[PDB]
Design a binder for this molecule. Structure first.
Ligand SMILES: CCOc1ccc(S(=O)(=O)Nc2cc(CC(C)=O)c(NS(=O)(=O)c3ccc(OCC)cc3)c3ccccc23)cc1
Length: 285
């Protein structure tokens, strides 16, 4: 019984929620709030612990990007601080390879990072690795075949359809085939050996479209679109289906969670979050 955990997010201000969804019975758990509110974070899991990485606290008193790494233990229902990153990273992307967390891109005020750093939980230390070829905020990250892909985003001037691949053993990045569509703030994940990029913002509108990358054919193909157009959506994969959570549709902050079934190539409404929000961090344990 693994749960879908959603941390933080934004509606009127950054949020402190930690909620978990159990797909096998439809139930939502209300778990311990984050110590500091944050939106534009990413979530991931190492060792059955949930990590909240980066983001920003957009509050009525003002706006502060986060270099924070916090760790939630589902056994104790408690958040514990970890070593902070080298730099704050709002609108960050994250991936895990061999039990190490990669923090990719993101912003600190006006600085759009190309830099990438790696956390080792066993030593509680971050270290920089080779930077990306492109500065990317609002970037999606997927891990596939022990390689890390950085997909789309915004480089400070252009919104991106480009994507790139990081080779940990070699410590190098290479550009891959660009997507069909410019996307920042998309949900990017891996399912059944393909990278999926769902939604985002193309410079003009929120998107419902979804495309997937086949690493051997080197081509992106559109699949069924989502039921809602969404940017700043959370994403994860649970039992062979993609789950997308919240986001901003151009007018409203959505509470909709939808599910992609790769067998039928369809999306379905599965549940609603307790309140609409965007810019959450999501992970499954
Ligand atoms: C009226 C819409 O207001 C908001 C306010 C805050 C958020 S948020 O979720 O807390 N912040 C973020 C904000 C944004 C930009 C905003 C303010 O929408 C991100 N990037 S983005 O969605 O690529 C995006 C969306 C729309 C844009 O044009 C005008 C509204 C530009 C870029 C994000 C990408 C990933 C994660 C978080 C993002 C999202 C929307």
């Amino acid at each position: 019984g693994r749960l879908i955990y959603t941390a933080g997010g934004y509606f009127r201000q950054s949020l402190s929620y930690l909620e978990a969804y159990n797909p096998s019975n439809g139930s939502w758990l209300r778990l311990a709030d984050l110590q500091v509110p944050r939106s534009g974070l990413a979530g991931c899991v190492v060792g059955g612990l949930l990590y909240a990485v980066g983001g920003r606290n957009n509050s009525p008193d003002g706006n502060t990007d986060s270099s924070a790494l916090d760790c939630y233990n589902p056994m104790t229902n408690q958040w514990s601080p970890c070593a902070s990153m080298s730099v704050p990273r709002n609108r960050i992307g994250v991936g895990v390879i061999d039990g190490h967390i990669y923090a990719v891109g993101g912003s600190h005020g006006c600085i759009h990072h190309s830099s990438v750093e790696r956390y080792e939980p066993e030593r509680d230390e971050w270290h920089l690795v080779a930077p990306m070829l492109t500065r990317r905020i609002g970037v999606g990250v997927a891990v596939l075949n022990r390689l890390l892909y950085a997909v789309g985003g915004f480089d400070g001037t252009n919104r991106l359809n480009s994507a790139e691949c990081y080779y940990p053993e070699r410590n190098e990045w290479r550009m891959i085939t660009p997507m069909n569509t410019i996307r920042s703030g998309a949900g990017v994940c891996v399912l059944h050996n393909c990278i999926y990029a769902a939604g985002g913002y193309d410079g003009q509108d929120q998107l419902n479209s979804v495309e997937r990358y086949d690493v051997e054919t080197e081509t992106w193909t559109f699949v069924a679109p989502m039921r809602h157009h969404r940017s700043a959506l959370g994403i994860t994969v649970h039992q062979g289906k993609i789950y997308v959570l919240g986001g901003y549709d151009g007018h409203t902050f959505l509470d909709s969670v939808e599910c992609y079934d790769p067998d039928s190539d369809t999306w379905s409404e599965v549940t609603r979050m307790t309140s609409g929000r965007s810019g959450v961090g999501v992970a499954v344990t």
